[PDB]
Design a protein around this ligand. Structure first.
Ligand SMILES: CC(=O)N[C@@H]1[C@@H](O[C@H]2O[C@H](CO)[C@H](O[C@H]3O[C@H](CO[C@@H]4O[C@@H](C)[C@H](O)[C@@H](O)[C@H]4O)[C@@H](O)[C@H](O)[C@H]3O)[C@H](O[C@@H]3O[C@H](CO)[C@@H](O)[C@H](O)[C@H]3NC(C)=O)[C@H]2O)[C@H](O)[C@@H](CO)O[C@@H]1O
Ligand SMILES: CC(=O)N[C@@H]1[C@@H](O[C@H]2O[C@H](CO)[C@H](O[C@H]3O[C@H](CO[C@@H]4O[C@@H](C)[C@H](O)[C@@H](O)[C@H]4O)[C@@H](O)[C@H](O)[C@H]3O)[C@H](O[C@@H]3O[C@H](CO)[C@@H](O)[C@H](O)[C@H]3NC(C)=O)[C@H]2O)[C@H](O)[C@@H](CO)O[C@@H]1O
Ligand SMILES: CC(=O)N[C@@H]1[C@@H](O[C@H]2O[C@H](CO)[C@H](O[C@H]3O[C@H](CO[C@@H]4O[C@@H](C)[C@H](O)[C@@H](O)[C@H]4O)[C@@H](O)[C@H](O)[C@H]3O)[C@H](O[C@@H]3O[C@H](CO)[C@@H](O)[C@H](O)[C@H]3NC(C)=O)[C@H]2O)[C@H](O)[C@@H](CO)O[C@@H]1O
Ligand code: NA
Ligand code: NA
Ligand code: NA
Ligand code: NA
Ligand code: NA
Ligand code: NA
Ligand code: NA
Ligand code: NA
Ligand code: NA
Lengths: 597, 597, 597
């Protein structure tokens, strides 16, 4: 019976087709052409083969898994998750992903085109979950790889608004696993309390994984949530570009970071962030060094836009019993960043760059060097005392700042009587512009507060662009901070009225290989001789000065002080001025003091 | 009758199908699978249901609208506009979009995949039109939102070449309206005389709207066209990336801009522009402040390539009777820009940055601050007198330039006897490289022409990199410009032969908190004493000088002038030189004059 | 017979369909809907119309060509190359592409969606080939254009691992030809020994061609391969963005470049490179000037990540008998680059920028100017003697460096007794940070080794950030290098112990329009007079010095040397110090020598 065959599930396999009636084309059956595509509807059926409508009382998980399993068996393809429907997930998956609280297991070469919505059912309320998992084993070390898996479309993953049940729980959207050529593009992740939205790689295993043109909206909502990083990049040659991240929770302002860059050759570009505590960590964790080595290098954070409450970029490296992690060859450029409206001390200490201790608080394990911070803007509102261009809280082996515009409370800061970092190769070029928003707010404060164990091979070229007479000093070194083989300068513009410009509480500017210059007021007295006549300082704290020159006009007719000075062994300054008429002269002059510059 | 059913429109609904003969798959009908996609052909039919071929004598509008209306009713989806066909539009739409001269009404969740061509018929010649409109009401204030609407593909929107009929008319390609998560990707807009190609948002209402990888080609063609901006970004968290803009009309060189960034958290990146008057406006219009506040902040213009005839980036902010607009936290970086080949004064005044008055010409309403211009190149051909790094034509509350390369006629310019802007926090770092293309062209001109009412808290560090002895001065302040709490320096390199370096026509460099240095030639005479001997200037216009030092060699054996000088109350310079043999000496020396630096 | 028609190839054309049972929709046949898409299966059939399975023993070429030819005839469309299959190509194409060793001929408006794999069969071993060719004629000058051709998908082009048979052979993946609005997106090119993977345009003919989000993996594998450039951009308004390039061969480290930018308005952005000799050439070849003029301008290399073995960006321009090529208006910004681990001299000389001779070795043909290198990082390991910020090997008409961080052996280098370039407008701003990795390695070497015929209108502002007492000098000019109208400065920080700072082997710092400053040690003797007393240098090689000042402390009580000095006609320095008590004094002081600064 022909009628019977046609009405049967093999019917389309009996109806002939030839593309556009082209006599040169293949003589196919309708089913062949329909078989070129596949959707969730092709697996979303009961045991008799009748289609099941999705909805809040239907658990779509087993059907989607069957679709992925079947396409995987044919070498791959793309499964569409249809538009105009919400597909709910309502149970855990089984096997290898159960160890990861997994819902769906991803498979190699099987792409998901999510055009409709995927939504978690209340079964998951107060429970852990990882929605899509690419590991195939509960132990990631024993997992196979996931390759050539792409998730893309105009659709949505909705985490149902459910809070965490316990802080120790973990929640994720996509864990690609040991992931090679995998990506998420176009998707909106929203409405949750999760740990991560996407994680790429596993402990350095993976390559060429990307997140592009995704949105992440309101993914922390509770005090229970221990920590949140929206994308964790844990394989090399991988990155995040052109994404949107937004949070509205108060809790997110204290715990949430947009991106973790944790392996070499990784990037974070062209993205916009609002409502987060932190922008990006750039870190080499020794505990994550298995797949790609012990070094994080070629790290790029560029051309992002951010409103955060804590720190924009945080650098780190640490050690384990048998591995040491190193961070080097980093670039941070083109970013425009602000600390959002908040009270002082109400969120983690505001910073553009933070050199942070390790997760246990250790500040003597880091090996961070060859970092370039250039062509960025940073702003914090004037009330935010806790705002810095760099908070330098752990050992630093080098960081270079060129041509940034920093408009916040401090330039360089570390809290006194906390950690005592060892600092090498800190370079603050004169082309860094220091803004004026916090003028008049700096009573008792040092603009560059050098609260370190030691500083070597460092450059700080201070250039103000407006007055701030509230500040205690432009730069201060406590006596506990050794300083050697360094260049510290304070340009005189906007400093004439400052009582202190640079302060060396241990007289460290006297060091043999310290090169400094800064303004000071000096009292001088002359001899009485008519004609060329010496002037000498009354104080004797200039034994370190190599030359000094006048920054003051001479209101006198009958004499002039020296234009330039040198020193004497007793620590006086001395120079030769001119008495048109004789007499002992006394003057108080603003000088530029110079040492070896 | 089985034959009858099969031949009927329900026939495919009787032919069974099961994906790849998989026994676990859904037992569907052919029509179910065909129903997973939708195209214009599914609505492009006569009242009897017979398909109609598109073409220049068929108006496809009602069919496309029916398709959008129907898909909208099912929760959304993607309508394909087929490749290999041109689909003409030949009438106005009806209802809510009639108030916007709308052709097609877009609807939420309904995407258009434009693979073929859409082409306007001559019905639209000399008339207004907006091809795709997302408003649902003639009054945008009473409109609902458009959400999740994406237009993408390899296809083309062709505006038929028709000129405007009257200057007051408006024409647009896509007006998304009060638009949330909407985008245009891949599409070519060409061949028209329009006001805009795409507009995003409405008066700050909207979010997450983007234009990516689109082309805009020849969209102004007539003298009637009043004004053209290719993409208008009027909602936050939105932007333009990786687009191509080109014009060939002469009129475009005087009226056309590529992008308007008019709300916070907006960007313009990675794009190429040719043939336009202007690159981008970055503006907060008080009249547009309803949806997202009164501040435009986090504005980003980065890594674009442009050949324009007028100004690359134009900044603005203005007020209404009850709202004041503010612009702050802007970054302009990585752009390479030139003024195209043209006669001087033949297009609007060439500039990299323009600080422009409001639309009525007011220059005393702006609140523009915290702008960073860094790491850009600008070039204008040597004949273009009207070319500047910045034309500063309205009040400015701050702008910072670091590490740019500007190769044009002026660095800082405003026309004398026009507006008198009040300038604060203008910072021109010494790392800005001033090119040499216009050397020898600058007779009668000041490189930095400070034609302002006042300048405060500003820095100008001039550094030449080649000679230009044609210029009247490196920097000039008219007597009408107050100057205070500022730093103005002229490096001596390539200046030895200049008669004027810095010029203060009101002697403003004498101010208590002005910090300056610049070269000058000075005549000095000594006393006759053998030995250490004073030299004094013949002129008395140095009462403001704090120190000066020699920039000239000493061709004498029998004496030497002072290496360094200070001043005296009568305005003479004085220093101590050395007469090996006695005698009154007279010399003319090049000095670096310094005040408080 | 109805049964007969239904089973025939016209069967689907008799089965009715109406979208979603919508009474307003078109009353179509199943075949109409199936005809909206097209795949390789629709042409991959034998002469009787039976489908043929692809595989290593089937040559899919004729079937894919038939598909492209047919779709082209209907106005275009998109052919899918199905996922889950490998499609082998095993013969050359015929006609116009035979002259290009072409396999498949691309056609206008016909896109390829490559979801599966395309793989070359061993027929191609040791032979030339170009897999996809858009020329339609063996002579490219007589070719028609290719327009609106896009290749995209998650699929793969695999070149079969075959080595080149002869060095003179050429191999390519995609040659778009005289190409307008063409692109490759998402595709992986791998496993070959080829000349290029993609070429865009032909000798300036073409426009709006792009390569985005592609991977290029292991595309050189033999010593026979003469030269490799992964993407060659030979039309304007075209570029490469967000790509991944990797090589593992030793040969690639000596021959392979990622990108060629060879026409105006072209870009290379956001890409990652590993294992290559070179990053990008930016060149105007006169021989390629036919389609778009003789000038390459608006050239952009930005925000790339690279590990290379030779040079990152190489600039060039050259001439033919009748055309002269010019390069100008270039920007290189935001790049983070390193020379990978290698022995010194084991690959082409390491550099960030190279100013290279033409292909015959000529260094006197170039017209390269208006280049900005800003905000980049460069690192080479300490053992790599052959590493430079710029190797300046051919005539240079201008290049500007601002705010970079260069950490390698040399800053400026050219080999002595090779070429003698004529240098104009070389600008090295003081904001360039010179790293310390190569400290102690520089015995016998000059950090800036100015091995040129002449230098004019140039600026070199040297600023160290750590000591390197191994170096012979910071900057050296041989006597053969003329120097005029230039500024050369050496900041004193970290230089106190250097015997030579700046060296002018021809005494070129004496030039009338040379502006210099650098530290030196000077021996001085005083007269015996008590009181103000002159000090004079013992040596007479300071006739060029305009002023000098002390960089040393004064360990004496009874006298002080001058703080500042000028010169005398005999070449002595002279200044006025102070003898508290009389006596002839002798001192050796570190001075900052200054000329016209
Ligand atoms: C939220 C965030 O990323 N915060 C980082 C911080 O990251 C560390 O702390 C977070 C806290 O959530 C992670 O530690 C938690 O998770 C790991 C991994 O979970 C296990 O392994 C995965 C593969 C499996 O699917 C799960 O079922 C678990 O079995 C637990 O081991 C740990 O006990 C728990 O606290 C984060 O771990 C990393 O997570 C990434 C992404 O999933 C994995 O690729 C890594 O393998 C895993 N690393 C390690 C060492 O386990 C911790 O690294 C950063 O340390 C910090 C400074 O950079 O910034 C943020 O605070
Ligand atoms: C071409 C361009 O954008 N030029 C800008 C300039 O913009 C102002 O002038 C232009 C001239 O074309 C616009 O003003 C015209 O259009 C508005 C808006 O049209 C009405 O509202 C829309 C929603 C509706 O669809 C239409 O049918 C109209 O009813 C008219 O009100 C105005 O009279 C007319 O001149 C531009 O208006 C803005 O247009 C954007 C994009 O469509 C809308 O989102 C805004 O709501 C609308 N703003 C206002 C205040 O109405 C004017 O703003 C800039 O001012 C200037 C400096 O930045 O740069 C360019 O010259
Ligand atoms: C690998 C590479 O690109 N290296 C560049 C170097 O480029 C020059 O040398 C390469 C060597 O492979 C090319 O020269 C070879 O190819 C050309 C072109 O082949 C012919 O024309 C094409 C259209 C046709 O399909 C083929 O069948 C051939 O008939 C031969 O003419 C030449 O003899 C041979 O050595 C490269 O040529 C350019 O190739 C691009 C891309 O295919 C074409 O668009 C251009 O038309 C062609 N240019 C010329 C002048 O022919 C040579 O230009 C660069 O010169 C160098 C410095 O910038 O960098 C790298 O080393
Ligand atoms: Na686990
Ligand atoms: Na660095
Ligand atoms: Na200490
Ligand atoms: Na209207
Ligand atoms: Na600023
Ligand atoms: Na005034
Ligand atoms: Na050929
Ligand atoms: Na330049
Ligand atoms: Na010479």
């Amino acid at each position: 019976q022909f009628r019977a065959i046609i009405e049967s599930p093999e019917g389309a396999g009996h109806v002939g087709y030839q593309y556009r009636r082209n006599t040169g084309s293949t003589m196919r059956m309708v089913s062949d052409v329909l078989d070129e595509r596949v959707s969730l509807w092709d697996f979303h059926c009961d045991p008799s083969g009748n289609v099941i409508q999705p909805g809040p009382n239907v658990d779509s998980r087993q059907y989607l898994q069957a679709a992925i399993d079947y396409v995987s068996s044919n070498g791959g393809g793309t499964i569409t998750i249809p538009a105009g429907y919400t597909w709910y997930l309502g149970s855990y998956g089984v096997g290898g992903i159960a160890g990861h609280s997994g819902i769906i297991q991803l498979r190699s070469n099987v792409n998901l085109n999510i055009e409709g919505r995927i939504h978690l059912s209340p079964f998951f309320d107060l429970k852990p979950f990882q929605v899509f998992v690419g590991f195939d084993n509960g132990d990631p070390a024993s997992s196979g790889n996931l390759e050539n898996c792409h998730i893309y479309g105009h659709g949505v993953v909705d985490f149902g608004g459910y809070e965490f049940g316990a802080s120790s729980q973990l929640r994720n959207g996509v864990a690609f696993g040991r992931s090679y050529n995998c990506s998420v593009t176009g998707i909106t992740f929203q409405n949750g309390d999760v740990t991560w939205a996407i994680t790429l790689g596993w402990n350095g295993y993976g390559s060429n994984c990307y997140v592009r043109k995704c949105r992440f909206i309101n993914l922390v909502n509770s005090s229970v949530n221990a920590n949140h990083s929206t994308v964790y990049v844990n394989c090399p040659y991988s990155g995040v570009e052109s994404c949107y991240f937004s949070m509205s929770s108060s809790f997110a302002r204290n715990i949430a970071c947009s991106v973790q860059l944790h392996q070499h050759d990784t990037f974070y570009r062209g993205s916009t962030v609002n409502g987060y505590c932190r922008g990006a960590y750039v870190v080499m964790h020794a505990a994550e060094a298995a797949g790609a080595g012990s070094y994080a290098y070629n790290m790029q954070v560029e051309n992002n836009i951010a409103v955060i409450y804590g720190q924009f970029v945080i650098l780190g490296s640490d050690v384990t019993a048998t591995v040491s992690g190193h961070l080097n060859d980093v670039i941070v450029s083109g970013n425009i960043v602000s600390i959002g409206e908040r009270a002082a001390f109400s969120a983690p200490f505001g910073a553009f760059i933070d050199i942070g201790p390790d997760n246990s608080g250790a500040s003597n394990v880091q090996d961070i060097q060859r970092v370039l911070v250039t062509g960025n803007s940073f702003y914090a509102p004037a009330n935010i005392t806790d705002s810095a261009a760099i908070t330098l809280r752990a050992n630093l082996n080098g960081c270079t700042f060129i041509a940034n515009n920093f408009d916040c409370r401090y330039m360089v800061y570390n809290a006194p009587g906390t950690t005592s970092p060892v600092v090498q190769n800190l370079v603050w070029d004169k082309s860094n512009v220091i803004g004026g928003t916090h003028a008049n707010q700096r009573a008792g404060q040092n603009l560059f507060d050098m609260q370190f164990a030691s500083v070597v091979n460092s450059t700080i070229e201070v250039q103000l662009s407006c007055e701030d007479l509230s500040m205690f000093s432009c730069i201060l070194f406590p006596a506990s901070c050794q300083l050697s083989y360094s260049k510290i300068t304070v340009d005189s513009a906007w400093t004439k009225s400052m009582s202190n410009t640079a302060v060396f509480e241990g007289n460290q500017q006297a060091g043999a290989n310290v090169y400094v210059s800064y303004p000071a007021t000096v009292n001088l007295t002359s001899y009485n001789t008519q004609g060329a006549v010496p002037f000498f300082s009354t104080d004797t704290n200039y034994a370190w000065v190599t030359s000094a020159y006048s920054l003051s006009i001479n209101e006198n007719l009958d004499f002039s002080p020296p234009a330039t000075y040198t020193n004497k062994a007793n620590g006086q300054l001395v120079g030769v001025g001119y008495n048109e008429i004789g007499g002992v002269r006394s003057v108080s002059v603003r000088l530029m003091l110079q040492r070896q510059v």
